């Protein structure tokens, strides 16, 4: 029953707030301003991980306002861009927590995506070099819905909520229908004193096997094609 | 060589999250702009207010082991 990203997203795509958002962005592009996640990538998060495969959920704010960075997935960057501060620290927690681990050489996380790790940003677009600029367009009300549906039609999903903004704030899920772990943002300004000791990655994997579901390989891999 | 202090990311934090580190409390939302550097293994952060103002609030320098050099702007 009702099991795909057509879930409401068949109505939540017809809705005026959502339609207007798309256009207001469409215009801005065409108007001369270069908005960032290329229109082709904007929805990658739902493309690499279908509603039924969502095992873990990591919430991000908005995308990278720099050239060539963002590609539709939270935290992740393209195959050759400098690993960002917060993803850099995310690697630190893994390098220590997950004993099999060892650090990659890039911040491309499409691997985690295709293993069921939803890398969802709360606002989907941003203006070049202007952070949180599209924070008044409605992506949040679209993204809230998303989270609602997951909390409605799914069970046993792990939500990794980092930072007072992701955590709670805009994340009031059913504590028993799902597993909600909280911690401070991995940003250098707060990674230490709060984040670094949490074993979210390991814990998120301990609870899966516990349910029989296969664990997540948290080490980045690299394909491509052509 | 005079060139670019490349901000790599900008994290939005609530005032109470910042107070928790800085010791001072921002009268609004803050945007943590971070530039990395594997030369000195340093994290340069510029804390400014939410869009569209971006009014500089503080500057924080952090070293390889997490020590913070704070300065109010």
UniProtKB/Swiss-Prot annotation, chain A:
**Reaction(s) the record says it catalyses:** Hydrolyzes single-stranded DNA or mismatched double-stranded DNA and polynucleotides, releasing free uracil
Q: Which GO terms describe its cellular component?
A: cytoplasm
One molecular function GO term is:
uracil DNA N-glycosylase activity
Query: What InterPro entries does its record include?
Result: UDG_fam1 (IPR002043), Ura-DNA_Glyclase_AS (IPR018085), Uracil-DNA_glycosylase-like (IPR005122), Uracil-DNA_glycosylase-like_sf (IPR036895)
Signal sequence span is none
Provide a GO biological process annotation: base-excision repair, AP site formation via deaminated base removal
Q: Source organism's superkingdom?
A: Bacteria
The EC number(s) attached to this protein equal 3.2.2.27
One of this protein's Pfam families, by short name?
UDG
Which keywords appear in this protein's UniProt record, sorted alphabetically?
A: Cytoplasm, DNA damage, DNA repair, Hydrolase
Give the subcellular location.
Answer: Cytoplasm
| Residues annotated as the enzyme's active site | 62
Function recorded in the entry: Excises uracil residues from the DNA which can arise as a result of misincorporation of dUMP residues by DNA polymerase or due to deamination of cytosine.
What is the similarity comment for this entry?
Answer: Belongs to the uracil-DNA glycosylase (UDG) superfamily. UNG family.
Subunit comment for this entry? Monomer.
> Which named protein is this?
Uracil-DNA glycosylase
Curated annotation (Swiss-Prot), chain B:
Q: Which Gene3D superfamilies match?
A: Bacteriophage PBS2, uracil-glycosylase inhibitor
Q: Which SUPFAM superfamilies match?
A: Uracil-DNA glycosylase inhibitor protein (SSF54441)
Q: Which InterPro entries match?
A: Phage_PBS2_Ugi (IPR024062), Ugi (IPR043805)
Sequence intervals crossing the membrane: none
- Superkingdom of origin organism: Viruses
Purpose of the protein: This protein binds specifically and reversibly to the host uracil-DNA glycosylase, preventing removal of uracil residues from PBS2 DNA by the host uracil-excision repair system.
User: What is the protein's given name?
Assistant: Uracil-DNA glycosylase inhibitor
High-level lineage:
Viruses, Duplodnaviria, Heunggongvirae, Uroviricota, Caudoviricetes
